[PDB]
Design a protein around this nucleic acid. Structure first.
Lengths: 110, 414, 59, 296, 192, 205, 205, 198, 102
RNA sequence: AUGCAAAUGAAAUU
RNA sequence: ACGAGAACUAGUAAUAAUUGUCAUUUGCAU
């Protein structure tokens, strides 16, 4: 599979660097433990609002810098996030965390 | 002294002088062992018999050539028997020990020939592949057979009769063999709690039955223990005289034995004896016919065990309390604790086995013996106070040499 | 200068795991790449011992 | 003249003298008495199968090989490997009878003689005061036999057709009762099948000068003297108890009997008889002595 | 005179230990597989039925050592592993026998000694067959009444050694009553 | 001849390590791969505890000779005065109800407590990994009682009651004073499975 | 024969971090996913405390060989002696009241606190993230006492309250030198669960 | 064996930024939603200042082996020798009078400071934000000194006086170089709680 | 939140050339109130009217957001949680407004 | 706003 | 009318006993 590798090795992303994802990473990591703490798979509406604000921050960060914008567009982050919000299943969120983490770890490797 | 006893005592010491000759320190007549042995044996009061001295001094061709003995004189027989049979200080020590045993342990009587055989066996067992002990015994046995054969055949002028090859060719020897039937089932019919004690006593009981049988047989035939060649397990072999009297008496004893054995168990133990003629020429490995005659007597023994019981015997067998716990047999009549009289005697003899060594054959005893006798247990002091005391390789090989091989095997296993 | 102490997480994950399982193996390779990136000795150990190809082969 | 084939599938104990003893083949005394007891259990009419049935001893079989007990003949040559041999396969039967068997061939035949294994099973007895109070148990050992999945025993019987049909009825009834020692203890059940082997029948239908006794026989009073003119035979003391005669089993015991074995050779045939060994009994107890001969 | 054949299967609820070998367990010497010898069945059945109360036992099982002779009217033979349990274990890759390590505790010293004991793997099935030879027409019902209780009693007991310590419970399934010799009907007797 | 059946369920309070297997595992069946509670452990723990309840003298300590009444319930029959057992203590098995519950809620059946074994001076802190059956698991158990004497049943039951009680304030398994292996009893059931003896007047807390 | 129970509540003054399970987790159960305090570390700490309070020699420190009365209180049974401990210590579990309080005030149970380490002559910081229980939390604990001798209770109990005091001005858990693990005890209760002994004059501060 | 408590108050004079929660927040207790000063911070600052005050070799810096006086006073147990810390440092909290005085006077606990940046050759102002702890507030702390040798107690207490002096003369937390961290000590208290040794 | 901003993209102009610089004061207003009173909400409304009078584009932005009824209902609820939810909403509006710009 | 995402150790005695 | 016949490889007792996931390392340079 290594879908993360495909984009990272292809591009870096017109000057992409790891610290340019810190808060984004931070935000994701926050939701991670938050997603860990929940028992049921059904996502609470407060967690939905967390997802929505994460989408908002994604867009703001993409507008702030062009290289991060190219990364998010080229890694399809926005449609993936939208689908995740639509499905409202925790396991798919954990898989998304794993995919994004693979992206981050790869991008740190190169 | 009965001339048979003279024959015995002379033959059993016929070639003694060798032990003096190789002694070196006792070589009075360093010309020949015969004269030397005669001189040494001429020192003793008990063995002061003269004809025995003549026998000892006159066992060889040169010696007999000029002795001018009578036509009827036993030593000539010894001659043929000898012919048929076929550090230094240690020897001096043996001379001292033999002088001691001869002055203090040996005496001349009708039944003292077994004593001579026992002490000589004690002493010469490794005095030469042939020990002197085996040589003396076989010479004596052969002389016994020869003397019985010639006296029975009304022949007295032996010096003219023998002093040869034709006599060698005459079938004057008989091979008789005995076979005990039911070793295995009689030894392995135990189920009680005294397994070891019963087992060890039954084994010795069967062994002593065999030994008492052979002793009674040899005694009745007036024959000696020299003629016994091997006993053990159930197989036992005797070389006896090839005479009509001997065959008849063998028959009669066989009949009486069978009558008893039918009276006791009726299946569990039975004895088969078989006899076949041979001549002296066959014992000398002349053409290896010795193995042939042995195999023949073996075949005969194998083929007499087929038809064992005649019509009247079985007819009675069919027309005539419960099983002993220790002895797996019902026919014998049980008593207290469900134990039979004979098997209870077995328990008693087992209890007496460990602490006592001598066994005495008498009229009352404890255990039942073949010829209306019994066996009891005593001690050496008690024994003195009473004063019988009991204390391919086979065939192919490479009489004296196979006999000594059997004796070696027996002594190793015993 | 490799130390077993720098392998702890990886070993732990192995002990944890010793179609969702395929994703677990993918996460294994993800953390493997991350550890190799973190330390140079771990990177050499993984690369020269053929860890990545055998990991892919199992998957 | 049909023969029956038996498979056991259960351990079975045969017994010779003591419970720890095991036998593989039994004699027509045990078999015929089994036939008698099952006939009486059936409530049938016994005269027909008593003085009209002819039965031989049982002999073991293998996958496709059949065996007979050794003939006690005088062969002139080792004298050892033949002694170490107990049974003869049907294939070389006449070869042995004409001496066409060699030492190496006998060695091979002995080698293929693996037809089952013997065992001793231990047990205890707690019917004793262990029921009541402190008392040690009373262990015993028993002997059992186990056959390989393609082994068993087979008979030979001959007679009139009505007798033989009755024999088949008795065989069906007996197939679910036992045929051994401790039957009621969990030993000795079997299933039968009737097979006509051409070679065995051919062997049965020869003609010769000697005779080989395949059952347990004993000549009557007036002919034995003519029976034993030239013979090689073996005696076997047959003793044992009886079933359903008098009050005490320990008190009741068949008188000792002596009989010829199943390897004997005769010149003059004798017809045998069923001999009573009964005394102080409310019914006679019959022992079987009627010979089934092999004439070659 | 007819013969009733009574067959079925029996399950191992808890590990079982007959183990005449010990501490090993009884088997067959070539198939290397466990058996449960019929003598043991008989002994337990005799013990329970006798402790239930005699004439019914002696008739059923046979003594003939007490001054009178009765022939055993019931024959029990051995049992064996079924094919179903065999394939079930083979496909699922489960060993046939379990090995338990035990321990013994000394007092005033408090030192521990080890033990090593084999037991049957739970859940297995055995196929069994009994034969009843009807010699008396007007009694078999009572006799079968007895045999009913027999299994019932054994239902709530154990087989083999160490039973009180928690092993040996067995179960009975698939019981059918058939007549195969004679002309006596067998459709009204029941065994659980 | 009556036989009495007791049925009920044992609930793990805190981690349990019976562990006859030796990674310091617990005993498991080879058919289901689930936790089990061996009967010999339950029986002997109750036996030892009830023996040490009353008098247990040094001479009594020496030979495992104990009180006549606990000897009555658990059977001794070792030397001389034979006493055949009276209680057949059957096992507990990992219940299926909790199997469904945990499977739905995605809980493993076993936790691995990682601990330390530090010493003094050298103070070697050896890391440890003890396997335990996670709390909330339930097992089903059955006991069997034989009535060797009718009039003695009540006291017999009375005695085993104390045993139940004492065990409820104690532990099974190892590491006991360190916290492991406290249990509770729940949902009992008593029934005379065979016989004609009424089992209404019975109760087991 | 009796069992004396000691019940109470652990109030965590500052942070507590056991972390046996390990960014850097704490030890937590699986049925409820709420933090717990095991008996094991509690026992080890109190034992070393009471050992240092009494004698402790280098040869004594070599192989965990300690003073005799501490041995009686905690059991060794190694040097050919019969000494089973008289004190059974439980794990401590997240209480109902505290979980309710943090539910009704919306406070997480766990904080991830970040630390830095500064390398010498480099001035480059290495960051760390440690998971610790938020303050004000309370656990429950229960202690079990065995009376092996009637003339040996109060003195050991005296030691125990001394031991408690030594804990109250020390730390239970990891990294206490850096200011986490301070605890306190509240609401001590002393009852004899089984037996005929009085627990009225017996107290632990 | 004994235990002597050390109790006292630290007063903040400048800004105070510890920012463990790090637009740049300050650590806060979730039971009170108020900032704190980690015990780790006090201990680490003290250890660094005393190590600099004593011998600080480059090789010793490379090997992180601390001076024997510091190493005994705060514990290392890192060179394979058993070395338990003789001193315990805890967190610190607001005083009651501090909170009362601030609540009565309508004065907040944190100050927002805008940090204006000018870039060389470019002069681009991008404002930054930082929070600071209000000066004039006081915290209460607790240290614990455990007695293992009855003789060197005075030496350790004198070294602790040197500790208090140096920490008063230096900065605590973040923003030290630009003027945040200057704190003082008041109301030091010594009163043994366990033992007979005072 | 996203819907209003993306659907108000007219031909490109956002609320006729709305720029975040004009939201500065409004942004600051919310920011202070984010750290934290009914009269404060009234003054927030007054500042909303002030900034909508400053520019017609901002007045349209506030009307097309239904901001005034939202603020009135927030004041009516007097719940701080609803105040925080409105803060989230206004932040979302500001962010999307930033996103859709020249 | 800009660097930081870990570091180090460690089954025993019946 | 079979070396037959009656015959639980039983009954007592468990992985027990001691061991601390701890020891140091500043949310901080611009």
């Amino acid at each position: 599979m290594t879908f993360a590798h495909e984009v990272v090795k292809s591009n870096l992303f017109n000057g992409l660097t790891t610290s340019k994802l810190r808060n984004l990473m931070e935000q994701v990591n926050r939701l991670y433990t938050i997603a860990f703490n929940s028992n049921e798979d059904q996502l609470n509406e407060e967690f939905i609002d967390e997802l929505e604000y994460l989408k908002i921050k994604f867009y703001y960060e993409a507008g702030r810098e062009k290289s991060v914008d190219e990364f998010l567009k080229k890694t399809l982050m926005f449609p993936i996030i939208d689908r995740v919000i639509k499905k409202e299943s925790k396991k798919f969120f954990l898989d998304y965390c794993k995919y994004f983490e693979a992206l981050v770890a790869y991008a740190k490797y190169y | 002294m009965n001339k048979k006893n003279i024959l015995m005592y002379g033959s059993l010491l016929h070639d003694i002088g060798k032990i003096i000759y190789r002694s070196g320190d006792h070589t009075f007549s360093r010309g020949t062992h015969s004269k030397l042995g005669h001189q040494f044996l001429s020192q003793f009061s008990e063995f002061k018999d003269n004809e025995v001295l003549d026998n000892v001094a006159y066992h060889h061709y040169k010696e007999l050539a000029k002795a001018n003995l009578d036509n009827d004189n036993t030593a000539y027989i010894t001659y043929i028997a000898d012919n048929i049979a076929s550090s230094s200080g240690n020897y001096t020590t043996l001379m001292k020990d033999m002088s001691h045993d001869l002055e203090h342990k040996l005496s001349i009587k009708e039944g003292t020939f077994p004593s001579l055989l026992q002490w000589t066996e004690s002493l010469w067992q490794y005095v030469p592949d042939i020990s002197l002990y085996d040589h003396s015994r076989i010479t004596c046995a052969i002389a016994s057979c020869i003397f019985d054969y010639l006296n029975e055949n009304n022949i007295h002028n032996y010096k003219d009769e023998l002093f040869t090859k034709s006599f060698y060719q005459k079938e004057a020897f008989l091979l008789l063999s005995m076979d005990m039937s039911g070793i295995q089932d009689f030894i392995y019919n135990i189920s009680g709690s005294k397994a070891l004690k019963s087992l060890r006593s039954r084994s010795f009981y069967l062994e002593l039955m065999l030994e008492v049988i052979v002793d009674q047989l040899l005694e009745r035939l007036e024959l000696a223990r020299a003629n016994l060649l091997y006993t053990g397990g159930g197989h036992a072999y005797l070389l006896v005289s090839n005479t009509d009297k001997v065959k008849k008496k063998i028959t009669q004893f066989n009949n009486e034995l069978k009558k008893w054995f039918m009276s006791e168990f009726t299946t569990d133990l039975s004895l088969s004896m078989a006899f076949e003629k041979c001549s002296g020429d066959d014992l000398m490995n002349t053409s290896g016919n010795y193995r042939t005659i042995w195999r023949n007597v073996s075949s005969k023994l194998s083929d007499i065990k087929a038809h064992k019981y005649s019509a009247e015997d079985i007819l009675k067998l069919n027309h005539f309390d419960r099983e002993c716990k220790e002895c797996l047999r019902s026919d014998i009549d049980i008593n207290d604790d469900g134990l039979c009289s004979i098997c209870e005697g077995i328990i008693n003899i087992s209890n007496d086995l460990r602490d006592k060594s001598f066994f005495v054959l008498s009229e009352t005893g404890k255990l039942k013996m073949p010829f209306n006798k019994f066996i009891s247990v005593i001690d050496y002091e008690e024994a003195e106070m009473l004063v019988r005391i009991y204390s391919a390789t086979f065939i192919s090989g490479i009489i004296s040499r196979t006999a000594t091989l059997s004796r070696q095997l027996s002594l190793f296993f015993k | 200068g490799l130390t077993t102490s720098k392998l702890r997480n990886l070993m732990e994950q192995v002990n944890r795991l010793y179609e969702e399982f395929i994703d677990e193996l993918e996460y294994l390779k993800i953390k493997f790449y991350y550890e190799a990136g973190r330390e140079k000795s771990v990177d050499e150990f993984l690369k020269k011992t053929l860890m990545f190809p055998i990991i892919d082969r199992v998957i | 003249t049909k023969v029956f084939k038996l498979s056991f599938k259960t351990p079975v104990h045969f017994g010779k003298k003591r419970l720890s003893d095991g036998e593989m083949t039994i004699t027509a005394d045990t078999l015929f008495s089994a036939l008698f007891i099952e006939t009486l259990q059936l409530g049938k009419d016994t005269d027909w199968l008593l003085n009209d049935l002819i039965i031989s001893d049982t002999f073991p079989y293998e996958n496709e090989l059949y065996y007979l007990p050794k003939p006690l003949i005088k062969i002139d040559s080792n004298h050892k490997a033949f002694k170490k041999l107990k049974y003869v396969p049907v294939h070389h039967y006449n070869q042995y009878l004409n001496g066409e068997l060699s030492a190496e061939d006998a060695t091979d035949l002995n080698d293929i003689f693996n037809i089952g294994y013997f065992s001793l099973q231990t047990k205890v007895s707690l019917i004793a005061q262990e029921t009541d109070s402190s008392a040690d148990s009373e262990p015993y050992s028993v002997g059992t036999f186990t056959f390989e999945p393609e082994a068993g025993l087979y008979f030979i019987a001959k007679g009139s057709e009505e007798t033989l049909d009755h024999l088949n009825n008795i065989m069906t009834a007996l197939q679910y009762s036992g045929l051994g020692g401790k039957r009621n203890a969990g030993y000795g059940q079997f299933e039968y099948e009737i097979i006509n082997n051409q070679q065995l029948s051919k062997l049965l239908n020869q003609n010769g000068k000697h005779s080989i006794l395949l059952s347990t026989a004993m000549a009557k009073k007036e002919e034995i003297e003519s029976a034993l003119k030239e013979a090689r035979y073996i005696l076997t003391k047959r003793s044992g108890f009886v079933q359903s005669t008098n009050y005490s089993e320990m008190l009741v015991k068949k008188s000792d009997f002596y009989s010829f074995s199943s390897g004997s050779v005769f010149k003059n045939i004798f017809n045998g008889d069923i001999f009573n060994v009964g005394h102080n009994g409310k019914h006679p107890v019959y022992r079987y002595a009627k010979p089934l001969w092999l004439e070659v | 005179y007819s013969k009733i054949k009574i067959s079925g299967t029996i399950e191992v609820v808890t590990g079982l230990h007959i183990g005449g070998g010990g501490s090993p367990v009884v088997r067959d010497l070539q198939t290397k597989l466990p058996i449960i010898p019929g003598s043991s069945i008989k002994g337990k059945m005799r013990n329970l039925l006798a402790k239930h109360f005699d004439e019914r036992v002696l008739r059923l099982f046979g003594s003939s050592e007490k001054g009178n002779i009765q022939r055993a009217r019931l024959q029990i033979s051995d049992a064996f592993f079924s094919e179903k349990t065999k394939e079930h274990f083979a496909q699922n890759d489960i060993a046939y026998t379990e090995t338990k390590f035990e321990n013994t505790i000394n007092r005033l010293t408090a030192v521990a000694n080890p033990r090593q004991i084999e037991r049957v793997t739970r859940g297995s099935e055995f196929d069994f067959v009994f034969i009843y030879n009807v010699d008396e027409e007007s009694q078999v019902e009572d006799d079968f009444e007895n045999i009913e209780k027999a299994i019932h009693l054994l239902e709530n007991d154990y087989l083999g050694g160490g039973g009180t310590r928690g092993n040996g419970r067995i179960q009975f399934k698939d019981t059918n009553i058939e007549t195969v010799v004679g002309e006596y009907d067998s459709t009204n007797l029941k065994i659980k």
